[PDB]
């Protein structure tokens, strides 16, 4: 195959040194690599990046899927609260996608690694008392993710797999949405074959996407409500002890997950709003952004000069 070159994203292959792989999907791999001269004004600067590449036995459809994925990153643009494409190596070698690197991984495991004592399933020797996330930290993380979906929906992007696994934590803890812009065909995804083998986020989807496969930004709002539930369960598994088979009748009967122990009532009503049965009455991400900013301003207990 051949790929037309784009001078704006094309980076020399020899300036990138691959390192230890970070995570492997069903078809593609991501590695932590070092890119030299990402800043055109600073050709000698080394940047830690995440490089995605196909497998050795990858098929042509996966190649087209990665081409579409890089193109979607290019059209959506740049935003702090999403993973941002930095460039691509398309000529004279395997297709490499150079994007930003998150040192602290996805927010589910990051939150799970910060659970306070008495809440742990097992003892964590890596517990640091100086990094414990206050309520302000959870509300700020939620605000950052909501800002990310506002940017995506502003670009007409439906994540379709919004999850705590699907947002990364930078070294600066700054939330960055991952796995967005995936034009993944909804042809046939089984409800009964776990992820990395093709399970839909059935515990993350809204009923319209669950039954009629209606994926929308309101489904995105529902999944972000699931994110809030997980965050205030500290990366908790949605619907604990609920089988996938019973999820259909539970959501159809209007059942919703309970109040997290350390979660306030206002945020709880926000979760109720995100989980409204009717998508049209579900709140839009801009209003979630403003409400979360207000909760942040109230929680941060810092004076600010109302101009």
């Amino acid at each position: 195959y051949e790929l037309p070159e784009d001078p704006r994203w094309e980076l020399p292959r020899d300036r990138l040194v691959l390192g230890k792989p970070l995570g492997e999907g069903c078809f593609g791999q991501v590695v932590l690599a070092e890119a030299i001269g990402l800043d055109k004004d600073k050709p000698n600067r080394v940047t830690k990046v995440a490089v995605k590449m196909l497998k050795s036995d990858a098929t042509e459809k996966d190649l087209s899927d990665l081409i579409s994925e890089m193109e979607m990153m290019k059209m959506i643009g740049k935003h702090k609260n999403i993973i941002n494409l930095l460039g691509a190596c398309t000529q004279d070698g395997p297709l490499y996608v150079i994007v930003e690197y998150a040192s602290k991984g996805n927010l589910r495991e990051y939150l799970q690694a910060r659970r306070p004592p008495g809440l742990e399933y097992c003892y964590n020797p890596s517990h640091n008392p100086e990094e414990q996330l206050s309520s302000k930290d959870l509300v700020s993380c939620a605000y950052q993710v909501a800002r990310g979906m506002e940017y995506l929906a502003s670009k007409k992007c439906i994540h379709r797999d919004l999850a705590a696994r699907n947002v990364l934590v930078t070294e600066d803890n700054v939330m960055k949405i991952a796995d967005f812009g995936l034009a993944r065909d909804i042809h046939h995804i089984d409800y009964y074959k776990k992820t990395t083998n093709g399970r839909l986020p059935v515990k993350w989807m809204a009923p319209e996407a669950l039954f009629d496969r209606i994926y929308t930004h309101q489904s995105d709002v529902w999944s972000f409500g699931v994110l809030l539930w997980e965050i205030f369960t500290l990366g908790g598994s949605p619907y604990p002890g609920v089988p996938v088979e019973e999820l259909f009748k539970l959501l159809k009967e209007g059942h919703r997950m309970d109040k997290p122990s350390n979660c306030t009532n206002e945020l709880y009503m926000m979760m109720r709003d995100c989980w409204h049965a009717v998508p049209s009455q579900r709140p839009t991400f801009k209003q979630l952004v403003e409400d979360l900013d207000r909760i942040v301003a109230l929680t941060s207990n810092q004076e600010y000069l109302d101009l």
Binding site: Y143, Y151, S154, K155, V174, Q302, L305, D306, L307
Partner: protein, 1062 residues
């Protein structure tokens, strides 16, 4: 002219008029209002009346000329303006005179312009010292801000102390002086400043007067030398002049009264006994009228102009056309004009071939430009006799074709007429005439017909270096199977307000707090930082009108884009928009209405600079310094364990470490220079010199350090080094010397390194790196390549007319080195080496030839640096045409100006009769030498030493006797620290004894140097005087820059006593 008339003339000059300004920098002229300012005595030209754009000191104006006869009016723009209205003014303290060219709108205005400028010039030259002190203080006030205001605040004063080269000791006695002078609320009216100024000098340097009174002497001062002002009484003052200063005209009291009346120049002081204050007496003792230099020699001595011309030292110059080095110097007629107005009376023309036929002038086989000959001679006439009407001697090193000499002589005669000398003045005489007899005449010196009536490659080339990775233009020459080349011939993130990683809000509030309190305390002033508490949001942490507060820059997304907004009242994209709109228009909270002032820079921006190392120990720093061969290399390093910094550099091939400390936010170098930022430090020292004459040119970064390690060999200059210097034709400019024998040149067809024409050195030893000189022209490349190639392997010449024109000063080499049979009509053209050989061998014979014959000496071509040689011995033997380069400034050159000041800078100086006697010998041995006059000198203090660079001077003084080897004695004065304006040399240090054997020709030379942070003396100012012109007493030497121009208020007090040996 009447005085009522003067009123209108000056007032008109004071009101000013729109006046067309020309200069070489702008092809299109600028309409700008020009007005004279009495208070500054500056003729300033600007657009807006609030601020004056260009400065022009009236005193440094050396002449005013009408018409369009200046280098500026060649843009063919003033052509529209009539000849009469146009003029130009020449000024400055450099051999090239910076010019201000003006085009008028009506003639009468132009005439009044020139008239007023002239009259102002004479009054300024006549102006009393306190008045000019007032003008200078006013100049400082005009400088501190361009609003021309008449007030100063505390902060402007403190920033003004460096301007006056005075250091504030602790800033706590300064407010005390404020209390004493009565000024309050940190404001200064003009006269409060004037009084404070006087008080500063007086309190600083009252020990001068403390020694002045001394004891065992006529009563001049009483015990009221306390800072309390006390009066100088007229009878006491004339007592002082008659006894201490030994002034004959001081015998009359009325003269003394007139002198006080002039010097004080106060219309309030109309008392029958005007009185000088004790501090005013100090100002007198530093003022010009108390110069050591005796006025009586200013009047050209006519009776001394009756001797035959063979008995006069003459003002002559060597290849004057060169305004700089003999090589690569612009040649302009203004060089000749300034030369003649100096008082030269013998000038050199090295005419060469004329392109269209009319000859030109340029130093032979060099790149100095060409100027047409007709302009040269026209300028010669138009300034031949204006300052001195005595005869001039134009010397011709003819080199053109016969027809071109014919045209040259024809132009001579047509433009000179009677001014030229075309017939002997005394046909039957057997000797040179008196200079008086040759007044208003022009002598042409040039090779005549024979006894029977019948008669290297150089250029600016290119240097490609892998280290520098750029092409540098270096001057290059070839000789002795080697080549020499000289030195070189020549937006949030990056803005100051953006501070990126700041530790905390408390830290930023502090940083702004110290920034405000040390200076510039403003209301609502800002500091842009990053919130450690709020994500994805900036922070405009702002001082609040005597306080500091913190508020984050609000941030929201809108339209998919960042909206760096603020409460929705104001939202923008580039932080610049909000910052500015908040600067002019106050931000409005329900609490207040406040703007933004200070965009403080980063605390350590130098970090982002590659040349800056974070923590580099001394030994490793030395290691990288020794690895790097280049001179001009520098690197800065934070000294471990201390907040202080160090800068390391290779110069002379020696590594050197300089320690820099920090006071407040300023970084202090040594103990004097205060620079805000290290980036500012390097940016400044790139365009100036720090050590010796070395400048910080080459940054030392590891990324360039590998490329250093790639190639580490550059051939270098290696008093044996001085021997190599004199050997190579490029002289002291030869930075790089390379044996061209070791290289086998091959011409690069296409060249390399992005240049059109280059050629390959290809050394014999293949490991030697190439050099690859490049040219401008392909033909130049071919010429150079073939040049190195052979390196590896009735009338005859003079046109009859011009030869007829010479009547005196005949060039004869027929006698060769023999001096026998001196005839009055001949000239001997000597070069310094052979001249000195003759002087060492047969000095008496040189003297005997001289008293009849003419002796012309010029420096060798090996001094392409225009450095003047040692000519004192030449006058001691009486050499007549001691031709020098006026475009330089060396000790010997100031000896020239000292000698030729006498006789009203008319260029002639009658030799003493005793040296003209047959019995006397020029060079006397030890036995014949007999001390003739003892001369005791004690310098005391100085005033207004100028400022060289950002470093405040630490001055000392050298007083010495420029003269013969037996006459050569020096004296240094204990250097003082951080005291430029009002320094005191040791009141305790003793007087120095000079013995003078030959007073009729010997020079008193005062010089002032400053001890740098490297303890290296540098040139501040000089004063050279013929000892015959030295007066006695306590007198103020008026100081003078290297180019023989006086500096305002520059003076050293010195007590000089000349006792003849009896």
């Amino acid at each position: 002219l009447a005085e009522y008339e003067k009123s209108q003339i000056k007032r008109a000059l004071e009101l000013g008029t729109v006046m067309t300004v020309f200069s070489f920098r702008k092809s299109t002229p600028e309409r700008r209002t020009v007005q004279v300012i009495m208070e500054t005595r500056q003729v300033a030209w600007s657009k807006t009346a609030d601020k004056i754009e260009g400065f022009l000191d009236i005193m440094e104006i050396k002449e005013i000329r009408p018409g369009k006869n200046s280098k500026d009016f060649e843009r063919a723009k003033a052509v529209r303006q009539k000849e009469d209205c146009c003029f130009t003014i020449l000024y400055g303290t450099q051999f090239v005179l910076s010019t201000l060219s003006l085009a008028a709108d009506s003639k009468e205005d132009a005439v009044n312009w020139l008239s007023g400028l002239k009259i102002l010039h004479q009054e300024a030259m006549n102006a009393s010292t306190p008045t000019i002190i007032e003008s200078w203080l006013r100049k400082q006030i005009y400088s501190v801000d361009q609003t021309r205001r008449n007030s100063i605040s505390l902060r402007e004063l403190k920033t003004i102390l460096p301007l006056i080269n005075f250091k504030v000791s602790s800033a706590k006695f300064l407010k005390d002086k404020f209390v004493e002078i009565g000024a309050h609320k940190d404001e200064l009216s003009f006269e409060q400043f004037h009084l404070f100024y006087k008080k500063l000098m007086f309190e600083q340097q009252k020990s001068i007067l403390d020694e002045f009174k001394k004891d065992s002497s006529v009563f001049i001062l009483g015990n009221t030398d306390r800072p309390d002002a006390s009066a100088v009484y007229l009878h006491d003052f004339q007592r002082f002049l008659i006894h201490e200063q030994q002034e004959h005209w001081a015998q009359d009291l009325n003269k003394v009264r007139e002198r006080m009346t002039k010097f004080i120049d106060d219309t309030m002081r109309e008392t029958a006994e005007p009185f000088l204050f004790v501090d005013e007496f100090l100002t007198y003792l530093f003022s010009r009228e108390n110069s050591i230099w005796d006025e009586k020699y200013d009047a050209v001595d006519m009776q001394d102009m009756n001797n035959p011309l063979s008995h006069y030292w003459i003002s002559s110059s060597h290849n004057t056309y060169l305004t700089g080095d003999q090589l690569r110097s612009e040649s302009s007629p203004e060089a000749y004009i300034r030369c003649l107005r100096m008082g030269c009376r013998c000038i050199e023309l090295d005419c060469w071939d004329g392109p269209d036929g009319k000859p030109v002038i340029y130093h032979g086989w060099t790149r100095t430009t060409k100027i047409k000959f007709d302009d040269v001679v026209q300028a010669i006439k138009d300034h031949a006799f204006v300052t001195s009407s005595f005869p001039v001697i134009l010397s011709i090193e003819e080199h053109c074709s016969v027809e071109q000499q014919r045209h040259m002589a024809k132009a001579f005669k047509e433009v000179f007429g009677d001014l030229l000398l075309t017939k002997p003045t005394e046909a039957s005489a057997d000797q040179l005439p008196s200079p008086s007899q040759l007044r208003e005449k022009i002598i042409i010196k040039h090779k005549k017909l024979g006894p029977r009536g019948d008669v290297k490659q150089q250029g600016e080339l290119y240097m490609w270096d892998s280290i520098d990775q750029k092409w540098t233009r270096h001057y290059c020459a070839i000789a002795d199977a080697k080549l020499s080349f000289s030195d070189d011939i020549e937006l949030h993130f990056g803005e100051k307000w953006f501070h990126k990683k700041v530790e905390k809000r408390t830290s930023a509030e502090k940083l702004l707090q110290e920034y405000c309190m040390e200076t510039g305390g403003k209301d609502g002033t800002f500091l842009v930082r990053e919130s450690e508490t709020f994500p994805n949001d900036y922070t405009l942490s702002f001082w609040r009108s005597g306080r500091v507060q913190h508020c984050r820059i609000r941030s929201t997304m809108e339209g998919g884009t960042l909206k760096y907004y603020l409460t929705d009242n104001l939202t923008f994209s580039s932080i610049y928009a909000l910052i500015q709109h908040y600067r002019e228009t106050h931000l409005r909270c329900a609490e207040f209405e406040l703007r933004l002032t200070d965009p403080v820079p980063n605390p350590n921006p130098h970090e982002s600079k590659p040349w800056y190392y974070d923590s580099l120990s001394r030994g490793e720093a030395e290691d990288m310094l020794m690895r790097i061969p280049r001179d001009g290399a520098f690197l800065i390093r934070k000294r471990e364990g201390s907040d202080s910094y160090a800068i390391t550099f290779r110069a002379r091939g020696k590594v050197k470490h300089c320690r820099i400390n920090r006071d407040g936010r300023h970084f202090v170098l040594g103990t004097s220079a205060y620079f805000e930022s290290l980036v500012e430090l390097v940016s400044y020292y790139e365009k100036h010199s720090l050590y010796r004459k070395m400048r910080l040119r080459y940054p030392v970064t590891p990324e360039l350090l590998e490329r250093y390690n790639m190639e580490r060999d550059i051939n270098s200059l290696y008093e044996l080094e001085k021997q190599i210097i004199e050997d190579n034709p490029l002289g002291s400019l030869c930075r790089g010397i390379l044996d061209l024998n070791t290289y086998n040149v091959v011409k690069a067809p296409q060249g390399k390194n992005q240049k059109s024409f280059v050629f390959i050195l290809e050394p014999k030893q293949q490991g030697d790196p190439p050099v690859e000189f490049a040219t401008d022209r392909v033909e130049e490349l071919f010429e150079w390549f073939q040049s190195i190639r052979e390196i590896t392997w009735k009338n005859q010449s003079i046109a009859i007319e011009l030869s007829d024109l010479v009547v005196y000063c005949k060039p004869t080499s027929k006698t060769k080195d023999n001096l026998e049979n001196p005839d009055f009509r001949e000239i001997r053209s000597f070069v310094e080496t052979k001249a000195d050989s003759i002087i060492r061998q047969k000095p008496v014979d040189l003297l005997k030839y001289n008293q009849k014959g003419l002796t012309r000496v010029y420096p060798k071509g090996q001094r392409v640096d225009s450095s003047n040689y040692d000519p004192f011995r030449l006058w001691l033997c009486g050499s007549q045409m001691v031709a020098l380069n006026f475009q330089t400034a060396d000790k010997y050159m100031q000896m020239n100006h000292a000698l030729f000041s006498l006789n009203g800078r008319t260029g002639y100086v009658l030799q003493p009769e005793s040296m003209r006697t047959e019995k006397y010998d020029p060079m006397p041995p030890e036995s014949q030498r007999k001390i003739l006059m003892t001369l005791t000198v004690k310098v005391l203090g100085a005033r207004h030493l100028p400022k060289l660079g950002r470093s405040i001077a630490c001055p000392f003084v050298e007083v010495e006797i420029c003269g013969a080897e037996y006459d050569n004695n020096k004296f240094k004065t204990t250097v003082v620290n951080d005291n430029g304006l009002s320094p005191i040399w040791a009141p305790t240090q003793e007087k120095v004894t000079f013995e003078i054997y030959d007073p009729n020709l010997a020079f008193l030379r005062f010089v002032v140097y400053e001890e740098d942070m490297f303890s290296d003396p540098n040139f501040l100012a000089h004063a050279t005087y013929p000892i015959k012109a030295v007066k006695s007493g306590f007198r103020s030497v008026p100081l003078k820059n290297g180019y023989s121009e006086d500096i305002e208020l520059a003076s050293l007090l010195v007590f000089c006593e000349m006792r003849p040996v009896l």
